[PDB]
Amino acid sequence: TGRIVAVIGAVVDVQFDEGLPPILNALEVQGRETRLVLEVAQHLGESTVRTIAMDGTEGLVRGQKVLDSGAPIKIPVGPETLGRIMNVIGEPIDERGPIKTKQFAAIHAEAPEFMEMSVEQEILVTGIKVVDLLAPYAKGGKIGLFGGAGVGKTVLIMELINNVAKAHGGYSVFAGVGERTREGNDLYHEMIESGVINLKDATSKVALVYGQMNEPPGARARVALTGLTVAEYFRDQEGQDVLLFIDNIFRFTQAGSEVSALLGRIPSAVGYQPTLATDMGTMQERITTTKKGSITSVQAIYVPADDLTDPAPATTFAHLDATTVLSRAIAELGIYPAVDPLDSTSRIMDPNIVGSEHYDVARGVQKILQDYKSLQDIIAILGMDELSEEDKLTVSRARKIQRFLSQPFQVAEVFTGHLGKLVPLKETIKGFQQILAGEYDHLPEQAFYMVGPIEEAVAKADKLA
Amino acid sequence: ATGRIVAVIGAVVDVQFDEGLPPILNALEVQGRETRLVLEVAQHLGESTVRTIAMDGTEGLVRGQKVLDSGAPIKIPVGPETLGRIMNVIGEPIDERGPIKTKQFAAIHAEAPEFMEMSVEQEILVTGIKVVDLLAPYAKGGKIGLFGGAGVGKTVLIMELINNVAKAHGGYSVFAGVGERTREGNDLYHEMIESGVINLKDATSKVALVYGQMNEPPGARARVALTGLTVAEYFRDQEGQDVLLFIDNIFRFTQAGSEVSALLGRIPSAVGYQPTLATDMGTMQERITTTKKGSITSVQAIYVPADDLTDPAPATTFAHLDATTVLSRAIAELGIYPAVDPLDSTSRIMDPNIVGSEHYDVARGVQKILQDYKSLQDIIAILGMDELSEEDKLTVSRARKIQRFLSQPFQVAEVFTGHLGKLVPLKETIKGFQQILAGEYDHLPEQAFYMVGPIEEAVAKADKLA
Amino acid sequence: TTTAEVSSILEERILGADTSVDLEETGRVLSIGDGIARVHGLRNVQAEEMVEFSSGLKGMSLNLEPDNVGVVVFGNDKLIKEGDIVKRTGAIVDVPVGEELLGRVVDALGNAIDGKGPIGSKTRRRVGLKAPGIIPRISVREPMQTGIKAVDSLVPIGRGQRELIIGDRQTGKTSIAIDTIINQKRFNDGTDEKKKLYCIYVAIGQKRSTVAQLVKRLTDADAMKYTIVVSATASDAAPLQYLAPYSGCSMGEYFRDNGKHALIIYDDLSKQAVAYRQMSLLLRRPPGREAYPGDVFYLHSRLLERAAKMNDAFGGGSLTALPVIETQAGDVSAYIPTNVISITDGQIFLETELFYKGIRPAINVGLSVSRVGSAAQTRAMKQVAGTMKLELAQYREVALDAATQQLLSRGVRLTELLKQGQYAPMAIEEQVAVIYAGVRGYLDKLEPSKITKFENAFLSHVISQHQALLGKIRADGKISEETDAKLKEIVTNFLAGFE
Amino acid sequence: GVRSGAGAVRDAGGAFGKKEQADEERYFRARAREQLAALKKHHEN
Amino acid sequence: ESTTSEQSARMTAMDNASKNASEMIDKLTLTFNRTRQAVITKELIEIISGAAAL
Ligand SMILES: Nc1ncnc2c1ncn2[C@@H]1O[C@H](COP(=O)(O)OP(=O)(O)OP(=O)(O)O)[C@@H](O)[C@H]1O
Numbered sequence A: 001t002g003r004i005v006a007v008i009g010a011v012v013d014v015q016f017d018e019g020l021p022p023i024l025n026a027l028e029v030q031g032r033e034t035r036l037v038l039e040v041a042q043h044l045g046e047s048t049v050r051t052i053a054m055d056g057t058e059g060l061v062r063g064q065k066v067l068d069s070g071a072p073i074k075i076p077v078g079p080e081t082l083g084r085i086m087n088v089i090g091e092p093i094d095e096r097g098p099i100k101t102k103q104f105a106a107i108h109a110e111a112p113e114f115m116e117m118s119v120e121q122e123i124l125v126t127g128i129k130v131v132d133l134l135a136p137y138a139k140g141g142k143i144g145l146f147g148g149a150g151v152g153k154t155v156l157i158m159e160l161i162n163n164v165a166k167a168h169g170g171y172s173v174f175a176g177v178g179e180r181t182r183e184g185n186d187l188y189h190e191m192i193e194s195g196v197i198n199l200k201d202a203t204s205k206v207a208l209v210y211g212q213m214n215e216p217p218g219a220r221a222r223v224a225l226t227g228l229t230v231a232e233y234f235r236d237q238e239g240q241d242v243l244l245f246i247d248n249i250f251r252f253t254q255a256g257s258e259v260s261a262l263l264g265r266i267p268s269a270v271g272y273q274p275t276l277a278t279d280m281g282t283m284q285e286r287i288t289t290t291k292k293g294s295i296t297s298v299q300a301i302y303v304p305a306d307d308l309t310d311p312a313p314a315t316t317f318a319h320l321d322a323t324t325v326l327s328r329a330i331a332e333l334g335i336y337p338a339v340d341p342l343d344s345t346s347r348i349m350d351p352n353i354v355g356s357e358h359y360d361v362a363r364g365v366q367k368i369l370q371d372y373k374s375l376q377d378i379i380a381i382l383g384m385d386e387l388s389e390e391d392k393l394t395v396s397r398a399r400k401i402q403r404f405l406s407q408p409f410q411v412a413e414v415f416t417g418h419l420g421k422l423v424p425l426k427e428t429i430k431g432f433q434q435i436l437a438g439e440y441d442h443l444p445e446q447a448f449y450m451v452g453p454i455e456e457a458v459a460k461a462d463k464l465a
Numbered sequence B: 001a002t003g004r005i006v007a008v009i010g011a012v013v014d015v016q017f018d019e020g021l022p023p024i025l026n027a028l029e030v031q032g033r034e035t036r037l038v039l040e041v042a043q044h045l046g047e048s049t050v051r052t053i054a055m056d057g058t059e060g061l062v063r064g065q066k067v068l069d070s071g072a073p074i075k076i077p078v079g080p081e082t083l084g085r086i087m088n089v090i091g092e093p094i095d096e097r098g099p100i101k102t103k104q105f106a107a108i109h110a111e112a113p114e115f116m117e118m119s120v121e122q123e124i125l126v127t128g129i130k131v132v133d134l135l136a137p138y139a140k141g142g143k144i145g146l147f148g149g150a151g152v153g154k155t156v157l158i159m160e161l162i163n164n165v166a167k168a169h170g171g172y173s174v175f176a177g178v179g180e181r182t183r184e185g186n187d188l189y190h191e192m193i194e195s196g197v198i199n200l201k202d203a204t205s206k207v208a209l210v211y212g213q214m215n216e217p218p219g220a221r222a223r224v225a226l227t228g229l230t231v232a233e234y235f236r237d238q239e240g241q242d243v244l245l246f247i248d249n250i251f252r253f254t255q256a257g258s259e260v261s262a263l264l265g266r267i268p269s270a271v272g273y274q275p276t277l278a279t280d281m282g283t284m285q286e287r288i289t290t291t292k293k294g295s296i297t298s299v300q301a302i303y304v305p306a307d308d309l310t311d312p313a314p315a316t317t318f319a320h321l322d323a324t325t326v327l328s329r330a331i332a333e334l335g336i337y338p339a340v341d342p343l344d345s346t347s348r349i350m351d352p353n354i355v356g357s358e359h360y361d362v363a364r365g366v367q368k369i370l371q372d373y374k375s376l377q378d379i380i381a382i383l384g385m386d387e388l389s390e391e392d393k394l395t396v397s398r399a400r401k402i403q404r405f406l407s408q409p410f411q412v413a414e415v416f417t418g419h420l421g422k423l424v425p426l427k428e429t430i431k432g433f434q435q436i437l438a439g440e441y442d443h444l445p446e447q448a449f450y451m452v453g454p455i456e457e458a459v460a461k462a463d464k465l466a
Numbered sequence C: 001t002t003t004a005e006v007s008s009i010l011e012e013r014i015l016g017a018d019t020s021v022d023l024e025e026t027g028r029v030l031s032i033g034d035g036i037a038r039v040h041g042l043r044n045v046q047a048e049e050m051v052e053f054s055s056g057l058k059g060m061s062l063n064l065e066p067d068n069v070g071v072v073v074f075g076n077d078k079l080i081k082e083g084d085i086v087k088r089t090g091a092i093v094d095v096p097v098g099e100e101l102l103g104r105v106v107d108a109l110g111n112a113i114d115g116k117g118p119i120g121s122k123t124r125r126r127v128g129l130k131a132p133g134i135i136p137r138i139s140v141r142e143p144m145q146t147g148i149k150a151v152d153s154l155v156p157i158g159r160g161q162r163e164l165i166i167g168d169r170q171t172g173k174t175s176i177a178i179d180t181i182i183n184q185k186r187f188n189d190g191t192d193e194k195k196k197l198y199c200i201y202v203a204i205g206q207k208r209s210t211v212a213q214l215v216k217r218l219t220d221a222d223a224m225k226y227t228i229v230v231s232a233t234a235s236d237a238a239p240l241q242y243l244a245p246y247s248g249c250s251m252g253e254y255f256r257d258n259g260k261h262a263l264i265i266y267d268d269l270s271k272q273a274v275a276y277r278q279m280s281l282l283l284r285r286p287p288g289r290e291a292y293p294g295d296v297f298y299l300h301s302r303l304l305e306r307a308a309k310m311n312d313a314f315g316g317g318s319l320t321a322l323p324v325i326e327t328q329a330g331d332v333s334a335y336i337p338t339n340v341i342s343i344t345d346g347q348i349f350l351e352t353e354l355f356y357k358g359i360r361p362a363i364n365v366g367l368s369v370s371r372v373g374s375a376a377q378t379r380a381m382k383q384v385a386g387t388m389k390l391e392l393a394q395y396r397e398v399a400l401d402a403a404t405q406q407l408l409s410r411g412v413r414l415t416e417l418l419k420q421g422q423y424a425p426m427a428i429e430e431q432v433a434v435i436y437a438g439v440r441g442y443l444d445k446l447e448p449s450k451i452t453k454f455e456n457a458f459l460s461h462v463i464s465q466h467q468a469l470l471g472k473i474r475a476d477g478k479i480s481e482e483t484d485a486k487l488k489e490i491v492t493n494f495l496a497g498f499e
Numbered sequence D: 001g002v003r004s005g006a007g008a009v010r011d012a013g014g015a016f017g018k019k020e021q022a023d024e025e026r027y028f029r030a031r032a033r034e035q036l037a038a039l040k041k042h043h044e045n
Numbered sequence E: 001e002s003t004t005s006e007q008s009a010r011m012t013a014m015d016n017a018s019k020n021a022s023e024m025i026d027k028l029t030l031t032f033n034r035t036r037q038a039v040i041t042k043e044l045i046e047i048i049s050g051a052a053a054l
């Protein structure tokens, strides 16, 4: 048991007598109404360890006794963490009683060893036609979800959770790093309405880990690790294809930079921490495909100053395996989900990974869309009669494709009254291949709007006239 | 007097002497090492403790190890026997041909020639390169600099200058390879052996080599230039000869100083450089001068980090040069080799009294038309060529032809592009550029002037693609 | 105050109990943090000597202060505490070396991470040996076939050369290296004993999954048996990433000094530079351009300069280096890229624009050069590649007259010819024949989109029945007049048959 | 996100700013000449 | 005929000018991002050096 000797800002220094705790150890301050957890960051010498705080440091007196927990910050983990909101230190903040689980796990864990890593890229079928076709999600990969509000990002997150739960039988974890309290409450209630989290029975699919903006930088620096530990439990002790969400990774980088600055470490370029690459790697490398299961991370990304070459977005892209961008223009066009079919890219979009047929279909779809963009420019400048019959048929096929990318969502059934569809990858590939082959060129444009498999498209065409 | 090693941090070693502190700039031999690790005293830290800069790797140094003071600065073998030999920073022959049996030794650190010893004679060193001869002519016995980024042509240009001048130079030559590729040094050594400028059999060699390369620790790279400069100083002063001093690259001296100053305990200057950035550079450079005893026609390659001429290291060295040749990456992108910038390279002998009225007029006209074209480049870039006036179109055409005609194949670059190197005389390039400015060749295509020598080659290339 | 002026050391001194503890050979950690551990004691420790902690981690004695020793920890600093006992190993930091590491995936320190057992090394080599001097080196003579048509044709890489693979993200920088690793299989299987090239791959900061998949690709192509994979991934500490290139460099130096030829792939040297910048900034050293230390150029120079070709006096071995530099938005004029360019003997630009358009590999043939590559190129490949390079340059110059139309057509045909698939390196004679087909104007008639199909069929045709001609080309090293006539006849016959 | 504003061509002081200034001056010199001629003709009355 | 040709050529020339301007815009945007990052780094380095030398 140590004593506080320095309360400079959020940095608290504790001097121990008997045994100095190792770095990244959780120290619990005594005499406070709310738990104050200090994480050891340095060994300053003279039996003194410099710690960062996970809560406000007001009311701390030089000489307050601090107990060494004996391990890093350990959070309640298990199947009972689903449908609950917990902060970085693991305390429940949903006012629904204690989270009663069987085991706890330290947030700071080593990345899986070299042998435990999988050696085969595999596509995680999300059930969404646009994602599964043009920008497939690699199992155990990282996805950069571009776009903010007004493009249905939260609806996409809920639908991804529901699809992964229904198809692969794997749970999901949402770790909100620096998430607004108002937006956190809105997302919580929206998820409650969507049914992905249930307050009555144990059918919830999301474990929420919220680090609000009003918390100290140390808390937001470890909220991502807390959510990642929650996902790691499901990956290891249950062998599920977990889905981790980080909203967003840029605030994780910012929290890391603030924590490093508080410790008096000389900043790197554009005012970032020296350990930016190493901290990002230690966070991301735990998101991989082990032999027991896998963790797939869909991380929202905010690009500072709209500069993709800034150190934070560059370091984040160093770990990304695919990108999904929600364009407001597509949403205004009326296509939901608003995933941009052109700007979205996937590293595993290679014939050796997804197969020759899938690669050919996706490349053809993208080529037709680009040709449609060029012909739309021509139509904007010249008249629609200028283009040939081939150009007109390509325009019609591309319109059919871009309306086929739209898909009803189960999470949105209560609102729009349209039944949600979980389109398998084979059905998506077959439908888009048949559309490219000109098989359904006689069907009207609206026959493919907001449908699942192409059979539903032909049924809707039959319904029309 | 023998001391004990107290601190070993990087290339900076701190030694405490029980008695007899060695003065600054004094060599100290470290006892107990298989090689010869010699430390150069830089500071007297007090408490009978000195701070030294090691001339080799500091691996294996134990605190308390005995180091013996040599009692004198780093001295190197110097004399006629150094010709045709390769030396390191501390004057150890690394050509495995035996010891350099010279009758005298010279201290590495010496004072620059005084004001009265300086010479003001100015001539023109015709190098056979169109851009250099026309716009920024070189002066015999004057400092010359070859600025440029990474892989823009500094090494190729300095090798071409060697091939043009040193082989035809009556006097001796000294090459100091500071912080460059070691394979380049091996290639230069074998080229000079083949060409006969270095002979391994009889004492007819004309060029002495000093090599401290990028593999060397920062302590070595900060003093090898001084070794080559000392050899050149001996050849200039004690023999009264005309000597060529080729240095490549001289920026690594400043970079080594910056590397060691962080450990030496100095508050960094701009861009993390040492505060003593201009003082040490001036001390090194002012020794490379033409005194009344002899002339040192020095050609120095200056690396430009991140292609930023405003960086302190390539910026403070402008004042130390008579003729400046600034290569540019943008020109090299267009294929115009050499990449000399005609609107950034300047010379001190570019004056009608020295270089002649016709030469000065031609050079000024070329610079004027190039500047006019560069000013017009923005409108051409945005609107298009068709928006210009007829006179503006004529100026653009003539300036593009001049840009093509500045390019010249090099003999050392023959193995690269396959085009035979051309060595134009001064009068021929003067006449060619005067004719181009006049308008006699306003009907030939632009490509007719690319990678050709005399204008006769341009006119004999134009009709090939008739 | 000072680091060793702490109250505990003062109490030990005044109490007189400074006799039981061995301060000559062991030491106790005063302060562990920021990746640098201050150790009190180790009075007989050496500069750069490797010291092992109580927990098991090993560290390098960087700073030998008068009262303490600054030790950089090759691992996570969590496992190191104040009061931990540090003991000397009596050796400058070295790495196990030899042929016993062939096929083993090791970390920065040489410890096996593939779970195949301990390394059976018998000799250890220092990771910081000086590069060979002027005399031991000789000019680059032997070719180093990569299997890539564009590389082996326009940017030839010699054996002992240092060629930089520079580009942006997802531009095929790693793919070129992997294909080069696979391409050497034909030489290693044979009994030439002078064309064998023992490859080495060093991963600096990249994902563990990527390294595992690369190892799987090498094993599936049966290329692991002659390559060494040194892994220092993102999860690994910054000192491991800093040290990883030097470990692989020493492993290649072993082959270099014993008359054998080796290839080392410093994948992501920019990430090593970032790790070293982190180490320096945590040491509170004055940053410079882009917050980098002032000795990053030395950091890369003392590494790449070790790759060289030795003369027959020193065994005649060699060590070819292919560093990889990641550039942001294609910024060639940046600190680290310009530093590496100033060190290497060439570069292979992989423009993202070409990669997006489908030109794989994305080599920018206009800006990609190889200084010492012409000497280390086979005569037949040189004969075809000179004409190919001239025609491509002329195509780039012009990109309605009949001549310029023909030039543009030939350039398009050659550009489509240079396109190559992945994980399928080609034999030197096969590339010679393919380039001969395009150069001699046997593809001007074909539609540009059919050139790849033509090559896919022509390779199969020649490799199946006309094996004698390829063998003759390989043995001679040049395309003779009789060889020229036979190749012309067969290519014309296949062109007629292709239709 | 980096954006621009109104009248930024002359602020840069490049080729286009000088071109615009010269064009405006040349046009308004002619307009001033015409107005002066008209004013003189009126003043003669 | 002349007015039709002139309008067509005006449209084509304006399109080419717009394309060239966009290319220059993206190049200058990359340069501006580099310069902004350099300025931030330089000012922070100055502040850190001033604080450390105290
Ligand atoms: N020759 C090729 N033909 C087709 N695709 C290729 C080729 N080379 C590489 N690729 C594709 O490029 C992608 C990744 O390339 P690679 O990893 O080699 O590039 P990189 O720039 O080195 O990557 P990173 O920066 O992520 O390490 C894969 O989708 C792969 O299929």
Ligand SMILES: Nc1ncnc2c1ncn2[C@@H]1O[C@H](COP(=O)(O)OP(=O)(O)O)[C@@H](O)[C@H]1O
Residues within 6 Å of the ligand: B148, B149, B150, B151, B152, B153, B154, B155, B156, B157, B337, B338, B408, B409, B410, B413, B416, B417, C341, C342, C369, C370, C371
């Ligand atoms: N005169 C020239 N003609 C053709 N190419 C040249 C010329 N000068 C330089 N180069 C190109 O530059 C490269 C060598 O540049 P180098 O002189 O080493 O520059 P640096 O010394 O700054 O690295 C060669 O690969 C060559 O292609």
Ligand SMILES: [Mg+2]
Residues within 6 Å of the ligand: B154, B155, B180
């Ligand atoms: Mg050079």
